[PDB]
């Protein structure tokens, strides 16, 4: 009893924002509080941020 069926495939590129779950391979889990600017990110003596 159906005339036609039009399927549409959408491709959504989703970035990483506060609220997404992150985890390692050892059972450590967490959710991202906020994306902190590069200027405010702690760095080492060589100047490479973390």
């Amino acid at each position: 009893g159906v005339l036609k069926i039009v399927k549409v495939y959408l491709a959504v590129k989703r970035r990483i924002q506060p609220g997404d779950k992150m985890a390692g391979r050892h059972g450590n889990k967490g959710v991202i509080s906020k994306i902190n600017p590069i200027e405010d990110m702690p760095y080492d003596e060589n100047g490479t941020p973390v």
Partner: protein
């Protein structure tokens, strides 16, 4: 309060560089450099690609016959293309290339106002004999990181569907580090000299960088200043 001036300016690599200001009072290296780096890592003019239209393609998620590089990876290779413009702000390049072999960034036809700091870059590899690519790259000036998702609000009626937006990353500077040690002035017991080692992308010269950093820093005090 002796006023500082730049002394040592030697750019070792096409990207790496070093700058230095010796005449600082006691413990001014931190005060000055930790703010100069915060200014550099956020506020620089730069230049980046915003719009890209490959002639055969309609959307980024697809392939093209002859090219072993996915359109997605092509655009990601386009985000890391260093370029410098002076006269205008909006500038559209023309990239037409055929034949087998990796397509370098030097295959772009030069425009009256453009320059490439590293043509050895690679847009994509071409594995077919008769495969040809014609793409118009839209580059412009800005400041900071502007992703494409946020960009579609003013929306300027972009008519043809074949226009693919790419994330814009105007960031001339890539890294900064600063050290301070006492280099004795002619008449001073201990004065700290500040050396800022840095890693650029090759577009903005290391001198205009620090001068504009001072510009953007001093402009913030305009609440309390007339002229000195």
């Amino acid at each position: 309060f002796l006023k500082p001036r730049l002394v040592d300016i030697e750019q070792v690599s096409s990207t790496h560089a070093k700058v230095t200001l010796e005449p600082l009072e006691r413990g001014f290296g931190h005060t000055l450099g930790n703010a100069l780096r915060r200014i550099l890592l956020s506020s620089m003019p730069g230049c980046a690609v915003t719009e890209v239209e490959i002639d055969g393609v309609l959307h980024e998620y697809s392939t093209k016959e002859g090219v072993q590089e996915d359109i997605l990876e092509i655009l990601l290779n386009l985000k890391g293309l260093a370029v410098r413009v002076q006269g205008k702000d909006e500038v559209i390049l023309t990239l037409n290339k055929s034949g087998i072999g990796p397509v370098t960034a030097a295959d772009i036809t030069h425009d009256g106002d453009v320059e490439i700091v590293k043509p050895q870059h690679v847009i994509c590899h071409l594995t077919d004999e008769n495969a040809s690519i014609s793409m118009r790259i839209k580059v412009q000036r800005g400041r900071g990181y502007v992703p494409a998702s946020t960009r579609i609000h003013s929306e300027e009626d972009e008519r043809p569907i074949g226009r693919l937006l790419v994330d814009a990353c105007y960031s001339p500077v890539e890294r900064i580090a600063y050290n301070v040690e006492a280099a004795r002035v002619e008449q001073r017991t201990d004065l700290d000299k500040l050396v800022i080692e840095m890693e650029t992308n090759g577009t903005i010269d290391p001198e205009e960088a620090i001068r504009r950093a001072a510009t953007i820093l001093a402009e913030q005090l305009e609440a309390f200043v007339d002229l000195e």
